[PDB]
Design a binder for this molecule. Structure first.
Ligand SMILES: [Ca+2]
Ligand SMILES: [Ca+2]
Ligand SMILES: [Ca+2]
Ligand SMILES: [Zn+2]
Length: 226
């Protein structure tokens, strides 16, 4: 890459930080959930991967540039009643104190009679949790990724109505899960909802690059076919 060390280490299933660079394709994707270039669609004159700096850079504040990692939001708020809200997230009861962007809009419990407003495409994620553990922890998994993406996610269902969670056999037992983004509330409160899953996948990869992911994700891909 930049080195012969990085050539050797690329795509070996381990993030090597000496190679965690745009030039080295984030260690052949080892550090970026296998995504070679999360900013491939970004037409900013800035190398936006260098501007994850806790400061607003407007040149990177577009969807294809990953909204500058949401660093152009001014009021960088967290969920005030995070403990209460986590336990009441997606529990089929509207908790008004949790009905805000920071709290993932109570997992859409307060928007139950509102039409779905799906982003185009499907997020395909491999996580190092076996299917049973993922299914049992699905609400927390969805809340965490939703919080990262500033929207609401759900596990996709197949045409039998079954949740699309499948065993994935690697060196560690994992799962492959298919997710959809529901913007039904996001669009009302936010100017930065993903209209398509491509940039959402890339933002997850970006968080992998930084090491700020809350769950042990292995890979993410945005699909239009599924
Ligand atoms: Ca590596
Ligand atoms: Ca920035
Ligand atoms: Ca609730
Ligand atoms: Zn936001």
């Amino acid at each position: 890459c930049l080195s012969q060390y990085c050539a050797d280490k690329a795509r070996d299933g381990v993030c090597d930080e000496a190679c965690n660079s745009h030039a080295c394709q984030w260690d052949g994707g080892d550090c970026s959930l296998t995504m070679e270039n999360p900013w491939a669609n970004c037409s900013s004159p800035l190398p936006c991967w260098d501007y994850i700096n806790n400061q607003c850079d407007e040149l990177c504040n577009t969807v294809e540039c990953l909204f500058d990692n949401f660093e152009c939001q001014g009021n960088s708020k967290t969920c005030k009643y995070d403990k209460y809200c986590a336990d009441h997230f997606k529990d089929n009861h509207c908790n008004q104190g949790c009905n805000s962007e920071e709290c993932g809009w109570d997992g859409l419990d307060c928007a139950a009679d509102q039409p779905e407003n799906l982003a185009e495409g499907t997020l395909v994620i491999v996580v190092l949790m076996p299917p049973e553990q993922l299914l049992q922890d699905a609400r927390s998994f969805l809340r965490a990724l939703g919080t990262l993406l500033h929207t609401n996610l759900r596990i996709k269902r197949d045409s039998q109505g079954e949740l699309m969670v499948y065993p994935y056999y690697g060196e560690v037992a994992g799962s492959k899960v298919f997710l959809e983004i529901d913007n039904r509330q996001c669009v009302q409160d936010s100017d930065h909802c993903f209209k398509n899953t491509d940039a959402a996948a890339a933002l997850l990869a970006s968080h992998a690059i930084q090491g700020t992911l809350s769950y042990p994700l292995v890979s993410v891909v945005s699909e239009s076919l599924t």
